Amino acid sequence: LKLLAFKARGYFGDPWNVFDFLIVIGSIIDVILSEIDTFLSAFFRLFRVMRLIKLLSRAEGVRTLLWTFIKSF
Amino acid sequence: MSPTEAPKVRVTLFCILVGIVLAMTAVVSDHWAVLSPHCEAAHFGLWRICTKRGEKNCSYFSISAAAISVFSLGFLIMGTICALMAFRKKRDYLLRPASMFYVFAGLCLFVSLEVMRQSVKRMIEYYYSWSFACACAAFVLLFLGGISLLLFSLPRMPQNPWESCMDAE
């Protein structure tokens, strides 16, 4: 939906959308893996957990504080 | 022109041009293991298993790594089509997605590397000379020429209150 609503030009424009893309792709590969395993990598099951970082996309005090310090370091 | 014609983004993009072929050197050469019973000396790979004492008998049987390295060669094509098209028409947002598939193509050799190790561990010694340290130099190239291209391709931290990530111009 997001892609259809940003011709892909404005979707990949927001630094958070890129993170979203990353998560999605990895999560899918994880499933396909768990699949080609039983049809015939404990690094891909970590893409499920990373979704939580999105929450940091709404929190504006946390995000702000975070940036503030991550900008001094 | 500022994130796509800077030299710091083209040193990295030419570095990926090295790792695009060294991971292709590995995915065809079957030399990253030595069976050593003591003759039954066999050299493992993904696609062919060849036992050398000429009596060069190369054949197939490993499946996990092979299947996993379709994707490591799959992401690579899919990343370059984003990268080859992002140097023209003044679009640079596309540069960032390309950097995604080079981390993935990096990490889908690292499963392959781990998958090939189990085969030699379950099967007389082991030694890798020609194509494990090739792919462990194309893993470390594509995995780290992808994350650095990512941080070299984003707008960058503002560093001031007025500056914003993704803004006017």
Side-chain angles (χ1 to χ4, degrees):
Chain A
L1 302 202
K2 300 251 197 121
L3 266 172
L4 307 178
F6 302 92
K7 211 74 163 27
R9 149 136 240 149
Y11 174 75
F12 282 118
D14 180 0
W16 284 102
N17 294 317
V18 187
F19 186 62
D20 266 334
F21 197 72
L22 188 109
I23 290 319
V24 179
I25 299 302
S27 85
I28 293 161
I29 294 192
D30 172 28
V31 175
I32 298 170
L33 225 65
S34 288
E35 226 93 300
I36 198 166
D37 187 80
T38 58
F39 188 82
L40 295 174
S41 72
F43 168 91
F44 279 92
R45 253 174 297 132
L46 244 67
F47 274 101
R48 321 199 275 206
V49 53
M50 239 46 91
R51 328 208 203 205
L52 272 69
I53 303 289
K54 311 192 173 184
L55 247 1
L56 221 246
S57 158
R58 270 317 336 249
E60 316 168 346
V62 178
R63 211 179 54 232
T64 296
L65 165 106
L66 261 172
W67 167 79
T68 294
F69 279 90
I70 295 185
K71 186 245 312 119
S72 311
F73 276 104
Chain B
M1 189 175 172
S2 65
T4 180
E5 297 289 329
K8 62 190 285 187
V9 83
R10 192 182 288 106
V11 170
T12 303
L13 194 275
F14 174 70
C15 179
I16 304 300
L17 192 276
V18 170
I20 192 171
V21 180
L22 297 182
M24 281 293 287
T25 297
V27 82
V28 298
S29 69
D30 48 0
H31 283 154
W32 57 72
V34 175
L35 176 62
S36 177
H38 302 287
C39 294
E40 293 182 355
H43 290 284
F44 297 104
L46 300 174
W47 294 97
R48 24 176 148 283
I49 297 169
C50 202
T51 297
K52 186 174 184 291
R53 304 292 186 183
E55 295 175 357
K56 181 181 179 179
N57 191 4
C58 299
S59 175
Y60 333 122
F61 191 78
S62 284
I63 273 41
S64 188
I68 272 332
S69 300
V70 180
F71 294 110
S72 172
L73 189 272
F75 278 152
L76 185 171
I77 306 167
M78 197 178 288
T80 302
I81 298 167
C82 296
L84 197 279
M85 85 187 354
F87 278 90
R88 282 280 206 291
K89 271 123 110 95
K90 289 13 128 106
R91 81 273 298 267
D92 299 330
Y93 58 90
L94 182 57
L95 299 297
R96 310 177 185 91
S99 175
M100 285 294 171
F101 295 115
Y102 288 149
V103 185
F104 278 109
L107 295 169
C108 287
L109 293 176
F110 182 75
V111 178
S112 199
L113 283 204
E114 284 316 308
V115 163
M116 239 353 120
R117 223 181 180 167
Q118 302 314 310
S119 186
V120 171
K121 260 347 247 43
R122 75 185 274 269
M123 279 186 187
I124 289 170
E125 295 296 327
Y126 62 91
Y127 180 64
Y128 55 87
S129 177
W130 182 263
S131 56
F132 191 87
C134 185
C136 200
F139 165 69
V140 183
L141 207 157
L142 288 179
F143 179 78
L144 193 271
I147 302 171
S148 293
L149 181 61
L150 188 59
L151 305 179
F152 296 164
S153 58
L154 300 168
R156 82 178 273 275
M157 307 281 280
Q159 276 288 336
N160 294 297
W162 55 85
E163 281 155 297
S164 315
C165 206
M166 159 249 283
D167 85 343
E169 97 155 272

